[PDB]
Design a protein around this ligand. Structure first.
Ligand SMILES: [Cs+]
Ligand SMILES: [Cs+]
Ligand SMILES: [Cs+]
Length: 341
């Protein structure tokens, strides 16, 4: 058995930015942008084969396939080969991170790439990635499951494979989840002894232009709530910390940020109204308070389910980043359609 699957999703987004620094027009306000945008349409192929003993071969090849014609590539969304059995599941390939998977219970919103941070809880998801890795996922037992995942040094830095001149960027990913009676709680995190961040505090490839080497890179996320009975509520707490590891005056000093997020939704027949709030507290950068990283956002909207596979989508969002006259405000709304096949 071999299956074709995917999601086609798109809409029109209206957005405005209030940034004193970049816009001379009155009040620091940009013009209003109106755009047809793909929301992340994708297409996949997957299969499994019973090997006879409660064991199965599994594989998946998933790709970005925006209906705007902007992606190219195979295997650039989660794609793997593995084996599943009484023992649980083992997979190797371009795999979601345990943090990336936990992101499903944090940020349910659909948007284009341009509005990811205002029509979605983009910022909290900055720690989420796909990685060339191996992963183990346990069976569920007494409502408990866990995952363990690893990125090899020579996958994190191909160039240095034979010369171990740069310190290793290998990383560890792990998670622990409990479901019972509509209640859920999970822990997800990662650790990298050495890593590299851009200024937005996403991880980037070693030797990327303006990458900032760090050491002791750790992320911790806790999410909890209730999902059942037409009611959805969740709350997430995230902690990110590292040491400056770039050679210079600031080497060894502490970076850190705490983020939180909350979503609630109710199902009214075919309509699901939803609201989300998130907050980034002031970061510590080289051991000093930095309110450029602080943010506050709120998103409201609704899905209308024409069918189990097809929804109309609407949302509106209001985001504030930084403090004072350096601050950026983004407002946006969209309307959209989603079809899962
Ligand atoms: Cs998205
Ligand atoms: Cs991300
Ligand atoms: Cs990556």
């Amino acid at each position: 058995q071999v299956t074709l699957y995917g999601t086609i999703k798109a809409g029109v987004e209206v957005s405005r930015v209030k940034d004193a620094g970049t816009y001379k027009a009155q009040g620091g306000k940009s013009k209003t942008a109106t755009q047809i945008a793909d929301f992340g349409s994708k297409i996949g192929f997957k299969g499994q084969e019973d090997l006879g003993n409660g064991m199965k071969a599994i594989w998946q090849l998933e790709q970005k396939a925006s209906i705007a014609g902007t992606n190219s590539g195979w295997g650039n969304r989660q794609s793997f080969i593995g084996l599943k059995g009484g023992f649980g599941t083992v997979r190797a390939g371009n795999l979601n991170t345990v943090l990336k998977d936990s992101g499903d219970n944090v940020n349910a919103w659909e948007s284009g790439s341009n509005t990811e941070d205002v029509l979605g809880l983009g910022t909290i998801g900055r720690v989420e990635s796909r990685e060339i890795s191996v992963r183990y996922d346990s069976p569920v037992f007494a409502g408990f499951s866990g995952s363990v995942q690893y990125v090899p040094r020579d996958n994190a830095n191909d160039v240095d494979k034979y010369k171990h001149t740069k310190s290793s960027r290998e990383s560890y990913h792990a998670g622990l989840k409990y479901e019972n009676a509509g209640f859920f709680g999970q822990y997800a995190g990662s650790f990298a002894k050495y890593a590299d961040l851009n200024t937005d505090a996403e991880r980037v490839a070693v030797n990327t232009a303006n990458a900032h080497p760090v050491k002791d890179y750790q992320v911790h996320r806790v999410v909890a709530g209730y999902d059942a009975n037409d009611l959805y509520v969740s709350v997430a707490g995230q902690y990110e910390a590292a040491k400056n590891n770039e050679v210079g005056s600031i080497k060894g000093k502490k970076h850190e940020q705490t983020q939180v997020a909350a979503t609630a939704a109710y199902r009214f027949g075919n309509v699901t109204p939803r609201v989300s709030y998130a907050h980034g507290f002031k970061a510590k950068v080289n051991g000093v308070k930095d309110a450029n990283y602080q943010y506050d956002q709120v998103i409201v909207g609704a899905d209308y389910d024409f069918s189990k596979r097809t929804s109309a989508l609407v949302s509106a969002g209001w985001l504030k980043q930084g403090k004072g006259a350096g601050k950026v405000e983004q407002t946006a709304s969209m309307v959209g359609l989603r079809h899962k096949f």
